[PDB]
Design a protein around this ligand. Structure first.
Ligand SMILES: *C(=N)[C@@H](NC(=O)[C@@H]1[C@@H]2[C@H](CN1C(=O)[C@H](NC(=O)C(F)(F)F)C(C)(C)C)C2(C)C)c1cncc2ccccc12
Ligand SMILES: *C(=N)[C@@H](NC(=O)[C@@H]1[C@@H]2[C@H](CN1C(=O)[C@H](NC(=O)C(F)(F)F)C(C)(C)C)C2(C)C)c1cncc2ccccc12
Lengths: 306, 306
């Protein structure tokens, strides 16, 4: 038992991280087979990143303007192209550590692990969710651009996120691995801001099931509610609506605990209307929304990856 | 910016995890050079683990009673011995993935990363602290015995923890890598229980500094206090005493924020006496004590590992 915000083992991704330098900008790249992926704003300078034209900036570059460092070895760039907001740097060596991988785009509400990197060297790993407003509440400093987010499904790394920028509220925005931003953010230095967020209702319910599984039951009650009457309460507390597909996804957890999904919604209603009254759930005094039903089954049942 | 509970990249440790089977018990082992380390209770059976004599149990075992699985390869055990509560299984192959490593024993209050494993396959990574009562609040199921806790200092893995058991409150107990338990726990199935815990004061203060660095300042005040008058409040709220060495360790963070350590203690006093009044700090409605001053400097400055 116990419940922790748990990331995937990062080894398979560590072997893909490299350092990309262009001009006086250094950031991280992702080396798979003979391609290095990195944020296109690497080709910009301080006065470029105000309002850049990336097609213009890139045509003025040469293969030799890109320095790729794989640990303490020199990768020769033999080609370069832009794909949306990422650069693809063709190099003369295939990464021998290339795992089986996919490029997938995730939904707000889903989670992934982040391997934060600086100068191509991995620094730490942690678990994030894609917020409903398409930002992520990450932990990122100067130099961290190009760190990636991923999930692991058996032996295959599904890359879903590459870091590009920090917004004024301290949250982070980036792209999928085909270079398409999550949310309405652009890789240029405007006054852009996050925009209003919501709480991920199905995840909160999943985490309440994790708490029951781990022995926290004080918030349970004999009450029930209808889906429609629950969603009225959700809207007022800026939770997002619960759908029948969410109820279905919570079925296994419902079955395992014997607590009907709509019964747990009634528990959530009461928590939203009364608060917790000085008590905690799974070591938190807040309702946690960054665990999916999958994450909970994973950790409260024990699946591995090879 | 941002602040996350961040673990070390796990790759260097993933390459050391193996599966150890003896009888009908399977758990995890740690393979360094030509030795596999694992909890000694692997040699016990259901009726053995009540009150075992491990010297008796081990003399009745042979090298061939230990099955060591390194992925999908067979390691031949060529020797076995007991060192306190761990077994050392001499195998006929040195682990080619052996990192530079040390065996260190940590202090309550210090943190480490855990690579939870099942059947020798790594499942997830997360960050824990050694509680003042020598337990850890981990996330561990059947089969997870022998997963290890570690820190990384540049390229060298300092192993500090190997998992042995879950206590009735759902918290976890284990040993250092020389087999000596943390705390007053034994690898036998008694009625043993955690014992009373305290909050790690210096860590809370460090985390308050992380919050200031990240823009949370609402809990700051013009008040100050003396170390003695702070420690009077700490005792009443079951925080542990703050020492002058703690004040010194918090110096860099103090300097960086311009908030004197004793000023931040006065802020902590007020938080303990008034609570937070519906506000949050770094996304928490509780005072967090599982980040050390080092962890905070690490994440709010950006050190890597190679
Ligand atoms: C990458 N290592 C770094 N981010 C950038 O360099 C991007 C890049 C340039 C500015 N930028 C930013 O993240 C923002 N800028 C913005 O315009 C904003 F707010 F997103 F709209 C700054 C935080 C630097 C002002 C362009 C082309 C958008 C990076 C990544 N994560 C965190 C972080 C923290 C501090 C400095 C740089 C950071
Ligand atoms: C290892 N994979 C497993 N732990 C054990 O097998 C140890 C081992 C036997 C019993 N044990 C336990 O962790 C406790 N037993 C206790 O006696 C206690 F509470 F610690 F005092 C049980 C939780 C199984 C009752 C001995 C020799 C102490 C393990 C490790 N982590 C979690 C976990 C959860 C469920 C089952 C087994 C678990």
């Amino acid at each position: 038992s116990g419940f922790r915000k748990m990331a995937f083992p990062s080894g398979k991704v560590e072997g893909c991280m490299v350092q990309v330098t262009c001009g006086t900008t250094t950031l991280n790249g992702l080396w798979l087979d003979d391609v290095v992926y990195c944020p296109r704003h690497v080709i910009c300078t301080s006065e470029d990143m105000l309002n850049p034209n990336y097609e213009d900036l890139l045509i003025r570059k040469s293969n030799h303007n890109f320095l790729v460092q794989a640990g303490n070895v020199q990768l020769r760039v033999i080609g370069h192209s832009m794909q949306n907001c990422v650069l693809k740097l063709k190099v003369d060596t295939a990464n021998p550590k290339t795992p089986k991988y996919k490029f997938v785009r995730i939904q707000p509400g889903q989670t992934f692990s982040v391997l934060a990197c600086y100068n191509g060297s991995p620094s730490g790993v942690y678990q994030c969710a894609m917020r409903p407003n398409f930002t992520i509440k990450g932990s990122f400093l100067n130099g961290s651009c190009g760190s990636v987010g991923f999930n692991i499904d058996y032996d295959c790394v599904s890359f879903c996120y590459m870091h590009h920028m920090e917004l004024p509220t301290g949250v982070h925005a980036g792209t999928d691995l085909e270079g398409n931003f999550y949310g309405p953010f652009v890789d240029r230095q405007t006054a852009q801001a996050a925009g209003t967020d919501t709480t991920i209702t199905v995840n909160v319910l999943a985490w309440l099931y994790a708490a029951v599984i781990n022995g926290d039951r004080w918030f349970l009650n004999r009450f029930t509610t209808t889906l429609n009457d629950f969603n009225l309460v959700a809207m007022k507390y800026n939770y997002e609506p619960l759908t029948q597909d969410h109820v279905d996804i919570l079925g296994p957890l419902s079955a395992q605990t014997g607590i009907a999904v709509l019964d747990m919604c009634a528990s959530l209603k009461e928590l939203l209307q009364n608060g917790m009254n000085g008590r905690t759930i799974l070591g938190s005094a807040l309702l946690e929304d960054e665990f999916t039903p999958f994450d909970v089954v994973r950790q409260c049942s024990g699946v591995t990856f090879q």
